[PDB]
Every structure is written in C-alpha cells, then in structure tokens.
Amino acid sequence: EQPEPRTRRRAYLWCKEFLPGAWRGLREDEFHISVIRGGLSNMLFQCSLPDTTATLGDEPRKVLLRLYGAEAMVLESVMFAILAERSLGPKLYGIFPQGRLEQFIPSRRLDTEELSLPDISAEIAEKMATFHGMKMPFNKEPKWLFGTMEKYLKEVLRIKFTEESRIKKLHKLLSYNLPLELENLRSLLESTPSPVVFCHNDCQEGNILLLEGRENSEKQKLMLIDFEYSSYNYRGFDIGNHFCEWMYDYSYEKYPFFRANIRKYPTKKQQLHFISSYLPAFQNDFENLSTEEKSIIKEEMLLEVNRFALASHFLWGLWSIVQAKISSIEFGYMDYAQARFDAYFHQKRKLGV
C-alpha cells in the first residue's frame, strides 16, 4: 500500500534531513515508502533507499517511520532513546513533533500458541528480567497500578452508553460492586511482597518480535517492543500480566475479534519453567544458591505472580469498558471486559482468596 502523496513527501523530507550518507543525496523520485499500518493515529511506514543507491557510511538502507496522528511525549521519547542506547530496543534515528524514525527490524510477531513453547517462554523470561534491571529517570513510587485502576473505575462509573447491548453489558459488569472488589484486591496485593522494577506492562505476543533468520537459534531470537505503557510497577504484575496473555488470541477474524481460553493459562509446571529462566537472568548469582533456597524463592514467586495476575484482569477489564466508550477500532470491547472479569473470579476462586 502507498501513502497519501502528502505523506510521501513529508516522509521523504524527514529521511533526507535526519539520516546521514546516501539519504542526503536521494532524489524524491527514487524514494521508496509503503504503509505497514494505517489508521488515524500511530501510523507506521517502511522507508527505503533504491537498490541502485549505495550506502556511503553505515546509514541504514531501510527505516521505520512512526507517525503520531491524533509531558507524556517527553517521557515516552526519553525512555525510547535510553532503551536504544542500551541496545534493548530499536535504534532511534530521528525525533520530531509529528513522529520518529526508528530502526527497522526484520521480524514477525509471535502468535498466542507460541508463548507456551518452552524455548520461547524461557527467552521471554530472560528478556523481561533484563528489562526489569533497567534504571530509568522516572518516578519509582509504584502508584501506576492502583492509580490507573482507580482512574479507570471512576471513568467507567460515569459512562453513559446509548446503544442497548452496551447498556446491558455494563449493568452486568457494574453489578459486582467494583469499588469494594478493587479495595479487596488492593488489600490482598498490599500483603503480597513484590519488588518494584521498571516493567513493560504489556508483554503480549503482539509486542514480541521473532527476529528474522534467528528462528532456529537456541537463545537470542526475540525482542520486546512497544514500550508506551512501561513504568515502575510491581514485578508480579509484569509476569502475571504475561501469563494472562496465554489465554487471549487477538487474531480471531470474526466478532468479537478475540478468543479466550481459560485452559491455556500456564500450568504450575509451565510457570516454574518461566520463573527458573527469569531468576538467574535477574539475580545472576542465583545458580549458586542451594536447591533448597532456590525452591523457596520459586514458591513465593508462584504465589506473587498469580495474585498479581488478578490485577491484570481487573485493570484491562476496566480499560476495555473505557475503550468501548471512547475507541473507534472494530473489536468486541464489552465482551472482552466480560472475559477478563470472568477470569478474575475464576482465578480468585482457585487462589482461595
């Protein structure tokens, strides 16, 4: 797909002015661009040199253009630049009011089923442990989790839908008495020790790259991307959120445009495999501990992450209701909220909370 003529010309100018080497001498009529993701906001394009133009230094031959569309920008930009310097995320080539030029990384995204592959899960754990070791210049108070759940709750209780099915669905969702349940959840998570770390906060399969050519490689075949929700937070949340994502498939091509399967949440066996990879990646002298000491740490982690997984359901369930009101993307947001709340109570029953 080709962009609007206007966009082609703005993109040409950004590449010409922000990129070194052959980009500086490029003629408009040899500039290549294609739409990766359309929409009104956060549009993605691939921009590239012609095959007939040689690289003059180490300028990239292909780049990703991200267009914003329609304080948060300061923090997002700084975070992205820092992660790029530290080689955790894609390189940053250009920043401007309308968007960014980022490294283009040949890859495809993982699907839901691939999250359960032992080899894949172990590397996700290592990548997340590496991400959790980042020191960042942002607020280190863990206010994000309940701060955000409270804000969303307030928004949800003020929604006035007009469409009949959404009115009905919301009435069912609010019938549980969410303020009390949120404060019971707050109570439980307060008594659940969990270190505050820099978390991704959105570790779903759609945010993990399987790097081109590395498919048959043992380690180092993945990259975590899309950091826009990252913040200091309880470690249990990041891991528990990721576990939740085993159950949801966003590639269903018919309404409600997702599939939920409770039976696909990781077994305790599968969780153990994941945390056994996470721990030595997070605390490097971990392997030097006695089998007994490692076992205690692992057991306590299992309880931590499964309690925090409840906050993933509660948060994204509320989030989804808000989206049903304010979004414009075709997706069964109310049905999705119901699925998250269904899982909240199912898991709560199983915990004995």
Ligand SMILES: CN(C)c1cc[n+](Cc2ccc(-c3ccccc3)cc2)cc1
């Ligand atoms: C805002 N944030 C970090 C979230 C929000 C929602 N979720 C779960 C979720 C993921 C994808 C979707 C979705 C929405 C529209 C189209 C395809 C997938 C919905 C909910 C995870 C993290």
